[PDB]
Structures are given as structure tokens and as C-alpha cells.
Design a protein around this ligand. Structure first.
Ligand SMILES: CNc1nc2cc(C(=O)NN)ccc2[nH]1
Ligand SMILES: CNc1nc2cc(C(=O)NN)ccc2[nH]1
Ligand SMILES: [Zn+2]
Ligand SMILES: [Zn+2]
Lengths: 368, 368
């Protein structure tokens, strides 16, 4: 089993499909990572996450360093053993959650807990991810809020590229990490094509196993996100995976794949599932709506998940309206399974040379 | 498959062990019924409930008639189909929850929802339980609060015995119910031996498939409950099952079996599981306690449940402290499995003629 081996098996336009082989398993691309921020994918056992088709999940440096603590997780055997997920885990490096939930300098950032005071830096972020035992480690960078000025973007991007170098060196200075895990760099530059190019060149100069597109899914709109992707993804090394952080709605994922993205993560299927939103091929539905009170059909008429094989909309309606935990469990399992079936349909259509048609057919029905 | 067939396979003192055969399955006695008040055993899929060893679960007439409604559940195919549990279901008849959560007469009771106004009577309670499709139907009675006067007890008991007759006739007047389901009567009389005898005679005069001991688990203390059981259970027909409603803690169950009880129900393993209390053979523990933050052992060192095979105390500690749904799921599955292993140990020890020794050994270690 290799440390990190990305193969592209088929292409169509800018879209690609293939695999990433790692020590703890194979990751089919394009891939969706369920989010497991507090060492759990909310309301699901790891076996259920795997059953839906997930190959890899996402954990969070910022959250786990606060609770229950990275030194503690290391002492208890690592994140995989701690939560019972034995497949690959990607860990965000803490930059986006420091800005979103929690005194910056060139050395790093000090911040207050969501409330004690804590510190993060490129070297400290990489060491926490070693302690957690992450398989895909993210370089630590400095995010700037949206809609950032053109100067707030260039300053955050330039620093992030210097921090990308220190992340590389810290990772490479840890033998167990460099031999068993992989390191991704994060392209910044906001919506500015020249800054995105400068970021891409700096990251390719350093050299990473994969490249993320940062600074999107921040309230910019899909048209702007698609516009930024149009020129930004072709700047990244073609032969490495492309990871769009924080995205997104089903139609966002399809358009992003059409533009060359290989990996995705978003809290939407879990979070909105608990809120009562179920994804279907005819678009989302709110299972709390009174129209579902006596609807015996499954959540989606085609879905293969265990929820749609056993329980009705009317039952899940009742559960969510009564605030029952089982309602959150069933809604979440269905939504994560819907996302995985979507990625499977994308992978199959690219490999068969009919992804353009699939995308057109998908949007025609989903937005009907 | 018979409608209702209770066999006693072995005895020891007053304790008995055996089976109840019903159309939807076999119920091993002494039995513990997990409580599924809102058409769900809280935080568990029915398959997980069955995995822990449960043969039968309990539903609630008062709750289901309010939400989502009994006529509705009937229209959607019945309670079994609605929630996905295809084995026996016992339904409490609504008397205790009317008094506890929600204008009485000889005809019945009118009350306000937990908030519209609603009505219950012996005939209306039996019809709701038919609509739900319950396998074991409970007679509708009139509970009086604890610590009831000697006059509040005799008046509630006498009315309950008249209501037990109307429940019998309403059940018997419904052909599908009388042929496929069973009917239990509820002994009342508070702590008064003469009233308990009058209740027992009236119920045996009518004739039921089983007999419950009502009016306990109301804040009377275990010594008083055991005292009431000492004379009350021998008043019931020996050849029918004896059901102690609302009980209870592990040591309550053992002492109750020693006194002739065959069936049990309590929210304690589910409710206190969500609150962080885990049952072990060395007594309960609060998994939130800081002493468990780095404890890699399972919840209980002997437990056979899937939770104790996979996850540590330290992980479940973290989950419950973060308010994670998975914490409630794992705590609940372990507690219900612990209860079922307790009943299995009771059944095995009675059948082997060593239940007295088991009870002594159990209490010595549980209260150490
Ligand atoms: C949900 N939106 C969203 N945007 C993100 C951006 C980043 C980023 O630029 N990290 N360096 C990370 C996670 C994100 N999640
Ligand atoms: C938890 N305690 C508890 N006591 C109960 C008494 C009755 C009763 O007398 N019904 N007729 C029913 C359920 C109970 N649950
Ligand atoms: Zn589904
Ligand atoms: Zn266990």
C-alpha cells in the first residue's frame, strides 16, 4: 500500500475521475468527505458512514485541539482509534475556523477559545495533525474575510505562501508523517486572477501531494465561484488532486467537477439533515412540511440507502417534528448516502464519456 | 403461531422463567421492554433494539393519540409498519400519563394536551390500541397520585375494576383484536393489602391474559414496593404473566423477580443513558466524570454489546461532554444491552436453580 498515489483513469473536458491510494485505503475521485469536526460525523456511527459509500472523512485541527485536546488524542492512540474510523482522514489546518469561530503576526496567530487563550502557527498546526494521526495534512494559512479588498487578499495570500513553505518543512522534518501521510497546499488570492496565479506558482514551486482551492464558499455566489474556478484550477498541477474546500450544494459539486475539482467537503448534508432538509433527485424537500404527514413514499424514490428501503416520509416527518434523535439519524444517513450516490454517478459518467449529458440531465430534473 | 401462550419452564421460590408465544414473536420471561413512547426507542433504530436482545417494546396510548394521532397511524398501516418494529408491542392504556402529564367521571376523563382538549374512556382507549395495532393491550384505569389517602385508593381501585370490565367487553367486541392480540388487567389498591385483594379478585373474576401490578414506582421506596409485592403478586393467577409497570433500577428488577414478576418496563436505561449514566456490574457510573477522560476501557469490562466491543469510556466521555448525538446513541445502546444481559442472567439462573445465589452475588458486586 502506497503512501499517496493519484491516478486519473478517465477524462471529459476538464473533469477527471480516478483514485488516490493511501496506507489506510483507496479514495475514489471525484470524492465527497463527510465532515466529522468533533471526532464524530454527527448522528452516525463510522460503520454507517462507510455504508453510505464514504472513502474518507474530514476532521478539524481547531476543534480537536480545544476538545478533547490533541496531546490527549495521541495518548489514547490517535484519532482513527479514538473515533473508530480506520480509513483515511483529512484534517483542515485551523486557519478558516480560527477566523470564523475564535492577534495575528508573521509568526502565527493567538486567539481565544469558542474560553481560554490558544496559539497556532504553521509548525504548531502540522504537529497537532501529527498528534491526531491525520492521513492528509493541510498546510496552515491565513484566511481573510469576504468580501476582502484587493489589498487584504494579496497580503493574506503572500503570507499564506510563506506559511506553506514552513508547513512543508515542518511536515518533512517529521519522519513518521512524511513517510505515511500526505500534505496539501492551499491556493489563495480571492477572486483576483493574478493573485491566484502567484499563489499557484508559489505552491507548485514548493511541491505538494495535492492542491486545494481556498477562499471560496464564503458567500460569493455560485456564478462568482464558478468564474474563479474557470481560471484558477488550470493553474494547479494537472497530475495532482484538486480539493475545493467547503463546497457544497449538489449543483455546486457538479459545476465544480466540470471545472476540474476532485475532492469536496461540506456540512450541508449533515447539518441541514438535522434541520429537516432531505436531498432528492427532484431537489431538496423540508420533511417538516405538512404535505408529508401521510406520505408513505421514501425520502427519494430512487435512493438505495437503508433509510429509503425501510421508512416512510410520514414517519421521518413525525420524528423530526417531535425532536427525536432517530429523526436526525435517519435524515443524516439518507443525505450522506445521497451525496455519495451523486459522486458515484459523476464518477461513472466521466468514465463513460457522458458526464456532460449527465450534468444537463441532473440540473434539468433537480431544478424542475 | 398462537395468539397468546404463556409457559413456565422452571421455578425457584416465587421466581419463574418461561416464554410467551404471540403471532409476531416469542417473549422470553422475565422480560424487559424498552420504552418507545413516541413511536421510537429514543436514539436507536429498531434493528439495534433487537440486537440488544429485546423481544418486545412498549408504546403509549396517551402520547401517540396526540402525535401523530391514532387514526393517522392506522391509515399509514399501523404502529409496527410505521416505526419498523415487526415484533410484539405492548401499549399502556393512557391512565398513568393522563395523570402525570395532562375532569374525571364514571364515563371517563377529559383533559388538555401537553394544547388541545381530548377525551379518554375504557372503550376509547381500547379502540386507540386497536388503531395502533398493539399486540398486548392494557385495560384503561384511573390512577390516583402518591402518597394517596386510604380513601383515594379504594375509590380509584373500585372504578378501575369497573373500567376493567368495560375494557374487556370493548376488546372482546372487536373480532380482529380478540383473535390476534391479548388483554392485560391492572391491579390497584395502593399499599393496602385488603384493597389489593379486592382488586385481584375482581380482575380474576373478569379473566385476562395477564395481570399487571399498578400503583408502584411512584416514589414509594424500594422497601415499601417490595413489601407491597410480597403479598400482592400471590393474589394474581399463578398461571398468567405478572407485569410490574414502570420498574425499574437493576436491583428493583432482581427483587421483583424474586417476588414473582415476569415483565418490566422503565425509561431509566434510555433516559439516564442520554444524561451520561452507564450501567455496569459494579454499579452505575457517570461517564461525564473527569476520571473517565483518558480511560481506554469499555463502559463495562464484561458487557457483550457492540459499544463495549469498539469504543472507549474516554471517547464516550468526550461525546457526551460535547453534546454529540452519537454519545446518546452509544450510551443508550449499551444501557439497553446491559438490561437485556441482566434479564438473560436472571432467566438462566432460575432455569438452573441458582437464582438465589445469583441475586446475592449480583447485589454484593453491584453495591460494592
Ligand atoms: C464552508 N466554506 C468554507 N470556506 C473555506 C475556506 C477554507 C480555506 O481557505 N482554508 N485555508 C477552508 C475551509 C472552508 N470552508
Ligand atoms: C414509572 N412509574 C410508573 N408507575 C406506573 C403505574 C402505572 C399504572 O398504575 N397504570 N394503570 C402505569 C405506568 C407506571 N409507570
Ligand atoms: Zn435514501
Ligand atoms: Zn456494553
Amino acid at each position: 500500500r502506497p503512501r499517496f498515489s493519484f491516478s486519473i483513469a478517465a477524462r471529459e473536458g476538464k473533469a477527471r475521475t480516478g483514485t488516490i491510494e493511501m496506507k489506510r485505503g483507496v479514495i475514489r475521485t471525484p470524492a465527497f468527505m463527510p465532515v466529522g469536526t468533533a471526532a464524530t460525523v454527527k448522528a452516525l456511527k463510522p460503520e454507517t458512514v462507510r455504508a453510505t459509500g464514504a472513502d474518507i472523512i474530514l476532521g478539524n485541527t481547531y476543534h480537536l485541539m480545544l476538545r478533547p485536546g490533541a496531546e490527549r488524542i495521541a495518548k489514547l492512540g490517535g484519532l482513527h482509534s479514538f473515533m473508530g474510523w480506520d480509513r483515511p482522514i483529512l484534517t483542515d489546518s485551523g486557519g478558516y475556523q480560527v477566523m470564523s469561530l475564535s492577534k495575528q503576526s508573521e509568526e502565527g496567530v493567538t486567539f481565544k477559545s469558542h474560553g481560554s487563550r490558544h496559539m497556532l502557527s504553521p509548525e504548531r498546526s502540522i504537529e497537532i495533525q501529527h498528534l491526531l494521526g491525520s492521513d492528509i495534512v493541510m498546510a496552515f494559512d491565513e484566511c481573510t474575510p469576504y468580501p476582502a479588498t484587493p489589498s487584504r487578499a494579496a497580503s493574506s495570500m503572500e503570507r499564506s505562501m510563506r506559511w506553506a513553505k514552513r508547513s512543508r518543512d515542518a511536515f518533512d522534518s517529521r519522519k513518521e508523517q512524511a513517510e505515511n501521510a500526505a500534505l496539501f497546499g492551499i491556493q489563495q488570492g480571492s477572486v483576483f486572477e493574478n493573485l491566484r496565479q502567484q499563489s499557484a506558482d508559489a505552491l507548485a514551486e514548493i511541491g505538494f501531494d495535492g492542491y486545494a482551492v481556498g477562499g471560496l464558499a464564503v458567500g460569493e455566489g455560485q456564478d462568482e465561484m464558478f468564474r474563479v474556478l474557470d481560471f484558477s484550477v488550470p493553474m494547479l498541477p494537472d497530475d495532482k488532486p484538486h480539493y475545493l474546500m467547503g463546497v457544497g450544494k449538489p449543483d455546486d459539486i457538479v459545476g465544480a467537477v466540470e471545472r476540474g475539482i476532485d475532492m469536496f467537503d461540506c456540512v450541508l448534508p449533515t447539518r441541514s439533515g438535522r434541520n429537516g432538509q432531505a436531498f432528492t433527485w427532484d431537489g431538496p424537500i423540508n420533511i417538516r412540511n405538512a404535505r408529508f404527514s401521510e406520505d408513505l413514499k421514501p425520502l427519494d424514490s430512487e435512493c438505495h440507502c437503508a433509510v429509503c428501503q425501510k421508512w416512510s416520509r410520514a414517519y421521518i416527518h413525525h420524528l423530526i417534528r417531535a425532536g427525536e434523535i432517530l429523526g436526525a439519524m435517519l435524515m443524516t444517513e439518507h443525505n450522506i448516502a445521497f451525496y455519495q450516490q451523486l459522486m458515484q454517478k459523476i464518477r461513472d459518467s466521466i468514465s463513460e464519456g457522458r458526464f456532460s449529458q449527465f450534468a444537463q440531465d441532473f440540473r434539468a430534473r433537480y431544478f424542475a
